[PDB]
Amino acid sequence: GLFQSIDKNHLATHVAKFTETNSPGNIGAYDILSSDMNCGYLDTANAGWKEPDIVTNDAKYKRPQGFVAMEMTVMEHLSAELRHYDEIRDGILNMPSMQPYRTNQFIKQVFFPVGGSYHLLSILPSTVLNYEVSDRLYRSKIPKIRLRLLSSNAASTTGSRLVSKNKWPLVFQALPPKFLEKNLAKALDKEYLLPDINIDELEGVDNGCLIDEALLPLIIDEGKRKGEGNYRPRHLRDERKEETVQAFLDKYGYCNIPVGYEVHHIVPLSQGGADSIKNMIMLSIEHHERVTEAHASY
Amino acid sequence: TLKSRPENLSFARCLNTTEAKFWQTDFLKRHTFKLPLLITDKAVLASKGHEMPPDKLEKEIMDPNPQKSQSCTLSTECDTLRIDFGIKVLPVKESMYSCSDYNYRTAIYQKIDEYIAEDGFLTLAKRYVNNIANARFLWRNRKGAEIIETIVTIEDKEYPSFNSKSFNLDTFVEDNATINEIAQQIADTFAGKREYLNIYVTCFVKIGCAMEVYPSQEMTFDDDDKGKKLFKFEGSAGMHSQKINNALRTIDTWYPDYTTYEFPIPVENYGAARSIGIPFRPDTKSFYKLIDRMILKNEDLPIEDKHYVMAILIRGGMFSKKQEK
Amino acid sequence: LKSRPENLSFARCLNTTEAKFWQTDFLKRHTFKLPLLITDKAVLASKGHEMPPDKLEKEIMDPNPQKSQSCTLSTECDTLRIDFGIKVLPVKESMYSCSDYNYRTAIYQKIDEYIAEDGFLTLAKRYVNNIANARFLWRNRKGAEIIETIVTIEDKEYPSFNSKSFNLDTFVEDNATINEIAQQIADTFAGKREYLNIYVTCFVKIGCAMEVYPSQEMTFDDKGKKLFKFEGSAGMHSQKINNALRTIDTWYPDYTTYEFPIPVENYGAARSIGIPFRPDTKSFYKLIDRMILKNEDLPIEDKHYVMAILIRGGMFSKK
Amino acid sequence: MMKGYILLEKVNIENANAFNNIIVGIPAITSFLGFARALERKLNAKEIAIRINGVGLEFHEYELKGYKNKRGQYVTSCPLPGSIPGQNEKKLDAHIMNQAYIDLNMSFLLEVEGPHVDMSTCKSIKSTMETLRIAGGIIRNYKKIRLIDTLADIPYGYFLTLRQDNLNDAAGDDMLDKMIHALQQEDTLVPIAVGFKALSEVGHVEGQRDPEKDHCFVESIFSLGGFECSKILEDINSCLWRYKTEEGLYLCTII
DNA sequence: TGCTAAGCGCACCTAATTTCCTGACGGCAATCCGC
Questions:
Q1: Rounded distance, CA B267 to CA B311, Å?
Q2: Contacts of B313 (CB under 8 A, 6+ apart)
Q3: Which terminus in chain B has less CB density within 10 A, N or C?
Q4: Which of B7, B221, B234 is the closest to A187 by Cβ?
């Protein structure tokens, strides 16, 4: 096996089948250029990819991906126990290199701006990098997420070796800071309360205003009860439009705002309330002063 | 001539549903009151009542089976569920994000404009508004409900609401005025006469007082924990967009054996519903053959097949050729 | 039809709400209710667990501090009030998954045959017998002067139940109220009525400052007594109410020896009497592979068991 | 012609991408600049010439789609895979690949240089940001498209600026070791995907999305960035991510 | 329709010690492979 299967196993830093395992052909790359060491970015030639990736196509020729994975590792082939296969005598270092020769719908292809024109970029993922990240983040305490998604069958189907050893990889966690994370409180502070009494059926309303004087206990009670403990700071308050006060009178004619009457947001726009036609009753300035003093002392 | 499909043909969605959020309300104050619905953790002690080999049965039939779960139930004083989600209708011609061949783009644009000429995305749109107005997006929340009320608000106009228990889940109505009014705007959005349509749907399901609410379940692969991990959106319960969208694409009643199985299926490529485990459109009435008979060996297919091909292109996906090495 | 479907599942047909606990006074039980809350109780103990002889010598007179929780009534209340409600759903409209359509047709045909024989009436009478005897009060039925269970459907409060006058090993079929509720559950199970919401309120006169036993929660890793809090107040799991409502099986092979009902499970497991009672040919798997896969007119008692599990639910799926 | 600054305030992105080979979190910066160039190309097709050359990336809230375990780590969810084109396309259960998804509320400050940059252009962006996607996620709602003048009309939020000097001046070894040591020293610093480096030469291969534009195979290159408040940001122009090309390097840089 | 302006709100010493912190049984079935 290990001396007749070295001719169909290819050598790669990059496999195309690690984005989607249905990418036809044996597509990938082997980048061996140089480390810049001061460039500002992490490439596969700038991290210490100690162990390369041997990518196969058929399950039969998987013997080089087994021999190189037995600890003593035969990766020692930069001790010299011999003759237990002769072709295998360091033929694991002049293997054919995975060369990019085509693209397909499963390789991620994107456009990039180059000088008024565009260049199509088909992104090949890096297996060896992901392996090195998973090794060097098990022994560390930086934020990390394990991606338990690839089963062993699909990892075998990828053809790679460092995906068959590392099917559930450990990767960096690049999240925004924790005080910027969604919760119920940061969402129930973007929803605004509406009152439980329809002004158009309020039993004592004179087409918009508060005729009966005993309804101001009811208006004050609903203004307290709905929204007693829901005070909101200025950034979390709803904006105060003029289309809303116009649309309120629009409901009953009353073009100019009636003199001696102020639009009252029944549930306050500080203790939670909506800038809506529901949350307004055109009460008298005396009773409006009474209600805006009653809610002041809570 | 055109002898194949393009080497990279892609299509975007044209009915982009958003995630859902679950609220708890009363019914006589459903327009004013709205409380958050939270997802609790419920641990269970069970018995090992699953099928096992007859040797393992003698060793494990009276063994405790503790399991981890989560559960969403209403409050003791709120009897209704409020789900609010939104859709972004988009044009079909302007949802082709990729096409390698220019002649296939010309031919497909001719076939979409020919569909705009004869039944300009209107029957499909009426079926999508029926799948909003029978409330098929209440997957297990439509069972045991006294009153279901569905409200649709395009732009800022609030349309007359729907009694979603007066619609059959296997019959699509083509006569209700509200459905026709919504469906014409969705048809004009699909044609390209409007560049976008924002629809907001709010449902009111009166199940009962402290009854169980069924969110969507999250596929979370963890080795340490294996339990019912339900969906929490902004701290509260909800549903994925894919669940609601799979509900809305259940409009296909044009498969080869509809007279036997008389139920709409979701519009997939090979007719693959996740309930029945046989492909419903596997060789001759599949999308790939019924688009290679439409665009490549030009031919006027029946209008039901044109409905299916256009419904696939509203669903959208990777629709290229069998990629070679 | 050979073999069950690869994805076969059933949903519940008796959805029980979680229970909330209250305190009342029995002569003021129709006008007065207070919340019952759980209190943390740290307890100091002696080391009374059984130890090996080389650990007992060192740790027999060692103090044992242990954490715990408890629920107790007030000094002014003599009665516990438990409120839960049950949603009855139809049986044919409860198959959540069935990959074969022929198997769906066969299940619907056999349920329709059972509706023809007995319209889910014996099963429903047994369910209302486990609402009327107050078996959902597990350790809260021990030491009670008067237990009164009131059942409300829609807006009609049915006549109340002297729950202590019901033997827990027999099932009454001559009570008018049980028959009238059970006929509605029977028509809901059959298909005539699409849903039925039944609200249960039970008054347990146990005494003053006596202990109320809620449902204890399950702890998995390496713990103390954590009792169930439903909306702040004490409460019980819906699972525990349903396991006391499905204690209707008097149809197992060894009933004449052990003459009491057991909860309806697939392999007939009973945790009280720690023996399996349906480990073989009278289990659900071999009674659903002999009712639909190889058509055989089973006895009516076995049919009661199959429909009772189809009201319970589960993943009954072959590989 | 007329330089200016348009702010697209509180854009709520739903189910964006989050996987860039070694990163699960904030999307790539090439994705946000692709939203910028897509907005540019759709405005320049309604006959509104506006060349967008610098994008600010503000952050208000996030939710990685998943759950937080009891040990404080993250488990990432995925939607159930449907029919995926290939040999196994007729099977009812499809293969699950590596994928992560995030929900973001972001505000984009754009450096816009056009003939006229007025509030009509803002209305054009409003009528153009409802047919586009950020990363690969849908836009649920946006607050307002407005013109800003200085660093005072900008709302509260935490920008993303490139911190490469905290990565070049790091402990030692190789760039991965420098990255891990730098993230140990500063805990308010995140890895970010910043562009691409070629693995081949410019040419025509078979299978391209556009058969007439040049093509090059690429790896993703990654760097460090951090968060600065809107109040404590000096002379803007340092939160503006801009395209920058070299021979073999397709980089997004804050100059 | 107003309800004040001004100064400032201690210096010391410390915050216990012993014995311990349960025993049980158990933690699902299905499916997620291209060639």
A1: 7
A2: B11, B14, B92, B95, B112
A3: N
A4: B234
Tokens 């790939």 found at: B288
Rounded to whole angstroms, the distance from the CA of residue A291 to the C1' of nucleotide E9 is 38
Rounded CA-CA distance A229/D204 in Å is: 66
Nucleotide in closest CA–C1' contact with D97: E32
How far is the C-alpha of A123 from the C-alpha of A19, rounded, in Å? 9
Return all residues near C161 (Cβ < 8 A) that are at least 6 apart: C132, C134, C148, C149, C150, C151, C177
Cα–Cα distances in angstroms (integers) from residue C19 to residues B73, C81, C141, C214, C215, in the given order: 12, 10, 16, 10, 10
* B225 contacts chain A (CB < 8 A): no
Cβ of A174 and D192 within 8 Å? Answer: yes
Judge whether D207 and B7 are in contact, CB under 8 Å. Answer: yes
Q: Is C182 helix (H, G, I), strand (E, B) or coil?
A: helix
The structure tokens 């047909």 sit at: C13
Instruction: Please answer whether residues C315 and C5 qualify as being in contact, where contact means their C-beta atoms are separated by less than 8 angstroms.
Output: no
Using the structure, give the distance in angstroms from the CA atom of A271 to the C1' atom of E5, rounded to a whole number. 34
- Interatomic CA distance for residues A290 and A287, integer angstroms: 5
Count CB neighbours of A141 within 10 A.
10
B37, B214 in Cβ contact below 8 A? no
Task: Tell me which amino acid residue B298 is.
Answer: N
Q: Experimental method for this entry?
A: cryo-EM
Partners of residue A202 in chain B, C-beta under 8 Å: none
Give the DSSP H/E element, type plus range, for residue C114.
helix C101-117
Distance CA B43, CA C147 (A): 30
Measured distance CA(B123)–CA(B117) in Å, rounded: 13
Q: CA neighbours within 13 Å on the CB side: how many for B171? A: 8
Resolution (Å) of this entry: 2.9
Q: How many residues does chain B have?
A: 325
Judging contact as 3 or more Cβ pairs under 8 Å, the answer for D and B is: yes
| Residue D32: count of CB within 10 angstroms of its CB | 22
Q: Tell me if chain C has a CB within 8 Å of the CB of B41.
A: no
Q: Which of B27, B65, B68, B76 has the most C C-beta neighbours within 10 Å, making it the best mutation to test the interface with C? A: B76
